[PDB]
Amino acid sequence: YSAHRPVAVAAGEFLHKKLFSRHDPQAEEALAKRRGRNSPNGNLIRMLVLFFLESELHEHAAYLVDSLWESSQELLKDWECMTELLLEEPVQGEEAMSDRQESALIELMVCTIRQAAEAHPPVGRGTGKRVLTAKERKTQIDDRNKLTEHFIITLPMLLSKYSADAEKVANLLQIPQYFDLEIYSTGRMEKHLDALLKQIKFVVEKHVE
DNA sequence: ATTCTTGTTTTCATATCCTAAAATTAAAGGGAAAATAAACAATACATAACAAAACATATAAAAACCACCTCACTAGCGCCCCCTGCTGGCCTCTGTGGGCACTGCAA
């Protein structure tokens, strides 16, 4: 949580090297990134959640995610994993996903996908001298595509699980600012758009905040 | 009457021209691997602008240095008794020199 971004990024790289050894032995593949299933990376997500819980020096993981951005690029785009570890009760036999842990994971997702859309660091870490390379912009575009197609699917039953949670709805409705809407015209998923519209209508008529 | 030169058509002849079948050869068409070039994007280098640090000047601020004044000390030479001891006449009291009257003795 240093104000100076290079110090924070170095600390986050150290943290990623240290506290992530569930199935990655910091060695070769075929057991390190993913074991071909929808399960190994769950525990990495788990001590991300626990680290955000214990880090009481911040109500938001914005600085933490920004520090852990470039070191864990492949891990932070695997949104489907903690998506099943948030909604549909995975086959790992773990405990119930705690409400405080649910809010922590949702805040982590807010941070990760907003840094996925816009690459500029937050205020205090800001520079203003940013130039976009071709690789940067193509990663941004296909990142936008994959998050759009993933989360037009996930947000309906996300809301259906968390309709009454005011702060979780407020956190979850910042991502649609970063959705390319013509993909809906190409993806033909306006029906899921309308389902989410009815769902957020239910939230609006159920919430007065 | 018989013999001899000269000019002009006839017909083989020998080079040439034309004709067509082979062959053939170069053009030319297409498949494909190099391949230079070019369009775009990234990195590094150089230039310009802004802000701050460093250098130089002025000024005055104690502050140091030098010279003059002043209040003493240090020499200096009379100045003035003052006391003490020798010296050179001075004078008068003893004392040195002498004239002479006087006496005791024994003629």
CA of A145 to C1' of B10 (A): 110
CA A163 to chain centre: 19
Handedness of CA A13, A15, A116, A6 (dihedral sign): negative
CA of A199 to C1' of B96 (A): 194
**Alpha helices by DSSP H, chain A:** 5-18, 42-54, 62-67, 73-76, 79-84, 99-117, 134-161, 166-172, 182-187, 190-206
Residue at A149: amino acid letter: E
Expressed in Å, this structure's resolution amounts to 6.5
How far, in Å, CA of A168 to CA of A82, rounded?
15
CA of A67 to C1' of B29 (A): 64
Which nucleotide shows the minimum CA-to-C1' distance to residue A131? B42
Task: State both tokens at A9.
Answer: 């990024």
Which nucleotide shows the minimum CA-to-C1' distance to residue A137? B41
How far, in Å, CA of A171 to CA of A2, rounded?
24
Task: State both tokens at A160.
Answer: 């259906």
Residue at A148: amino acid letter: T
Is residue A168 within 8 A of residue A102, CB to CB? The reply is yes
Determination method here?
cryo-EM
CA of A3 to C1' of B51 (A): 25
How far, in Å, CA of A52 to CA of A19, rounded?
13
Is residue A108 within 8 A of residue A49, CB to CB? The reply is yes
Positions of strand B less than 7 angstroms from a protein CB: 41-43
